[PDB]
Design a protein around this ligand. Sequence first.
Ligand SMILES: CC(C)CC(=O)C(O)(O)[C@@H](O)COP(=O)(O)O
Ligand SMILES: CC(C)CC(=O)C(O)(O)[C@@H](O)COP(=O)(O)O
Lengths: 247, 248
Amino acid sequence: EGCLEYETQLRRQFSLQHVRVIPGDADVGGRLGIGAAHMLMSLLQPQQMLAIGFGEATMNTLQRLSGFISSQQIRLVTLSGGVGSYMTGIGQLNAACSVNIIPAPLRASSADIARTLKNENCVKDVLLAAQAADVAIVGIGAVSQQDDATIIRSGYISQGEQLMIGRKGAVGDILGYFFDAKGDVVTNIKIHNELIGLPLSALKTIPVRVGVAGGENKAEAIAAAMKGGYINALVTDQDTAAAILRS
Amino acid sequence: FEGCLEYETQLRRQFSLQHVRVIPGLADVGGRLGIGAAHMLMSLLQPQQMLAIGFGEATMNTLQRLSGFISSQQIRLVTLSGGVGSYMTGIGQLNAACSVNIIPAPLRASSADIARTLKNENCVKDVLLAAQAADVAIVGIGAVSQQDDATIIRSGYISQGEQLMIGRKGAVGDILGYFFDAKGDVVTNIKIHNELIGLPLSALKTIPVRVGVAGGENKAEAIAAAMKGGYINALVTDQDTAAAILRS
Ligand SMILES: CC(C)CC(=O)C(O)(O)[C@@H](O)COP(=O)(O)O
Ligand SMILES: CC(C)CC(=O)C(O)(O)[C@@H](O)COP(=O)(O)O
């Protein structure tokens, strides 16, 4: 319904490997989890390793994917710290499920503390495992969401921080790393050296990296994520796909 | 004379416990401990109360038996220790209505200064406060006598050389990685103690009901010391262990 054509155009414009565009009406957050869970069911082979990001679209996707995770013995690994944030999509599975979790906060209070935690063995071990995954699933945050962004509502940055990240040219983020409209990570940003998880440069080792995000206010962030290479597959909705293509 | 019901009463009066269950020593030990211990916690937890959960085999076994109850009675759970991952056997199996509060840190830091830094991060401190405020705790008890079989060795939280020195220094057992001597006092000069991130035993004692779940005759000295120090005020154990504790 224009969805096949959007998929084709996004695929070619951003040189993607896989794309799914969901129709334009009741539950978009929810049909996005379904769309992405389907895409993951078709990419993942039994016993493969899935690296999981933070936030609402990803947790929604994981809840929907749980019987597939058990049935196919998929191994999960956290791309980010914070632990507890993942209990909604993990308080959800079974004890035979291998779940590999970074045992640290998502963001440390100083960059020196982030570097110390990243060198602890039990942390370093999981960071390697995550970079070795077969597929990644991640959300995409947008500066233009303002107070509605997950990163603000969770408390991981302050409003003052968000304002300055915007002033500095960032349009969006993956895993708390903010990039400009061309897709380059923005240089001068305190949270980037405080985060404990895998940097975006390392996420790119994973061969299939699926972003799941929608809402027209995310269109610029999603375009820039693709231009930067962070994701090479996308699950989004029809209005957002339109907006992305005109960006 | 005697039997399990007599050991229960005697353990209760000798160590001033609030609750005790001794399961008969016939099938599967750790499995039946798990079941005994879940029934005990099913009697103690009122709806929407908070349970603080320790580390190791008997606690994880217990939690698994407790899931239906945890979900149906809306029990909130909070980790007494760091380490995060170890905790996914027993809480793995729970609805998403389940409030599970987890210390977002390793179980043991590589240095005391790193442990002090992590305890002071806000997301860590907040959970350490919630844990200390729990209504009921469930912990296991480790013993120096178990040597290579001790969960603490098998999981790699201490080395063999550490264990030998801990024993040379007079320790008999541990709760949450903290090693105490035969009278129930924490042994003072032990490196792991200042590298652990979770709640110290002094703070564990704020929780009003503290259930230890442990079995095997090699643990009898550790379990007795644990009660003498006051760390647990309730016990789930097996018949032979109970008999050994009593002749301790
Ligand atoms: C890492 C976290 C602090 C921020 C983050 O991951 C995000 O990239 O901002 C992510 O939350 C966006 O996804 P949604 O929560 O689905 O909007
Ligand atoms: C904190 C952990 C490293 C050690 C610990 O808690 C413990 O007390 O030794 C515990 O493992 C003993 O319980 P069991 O594993 O059931 O024998």
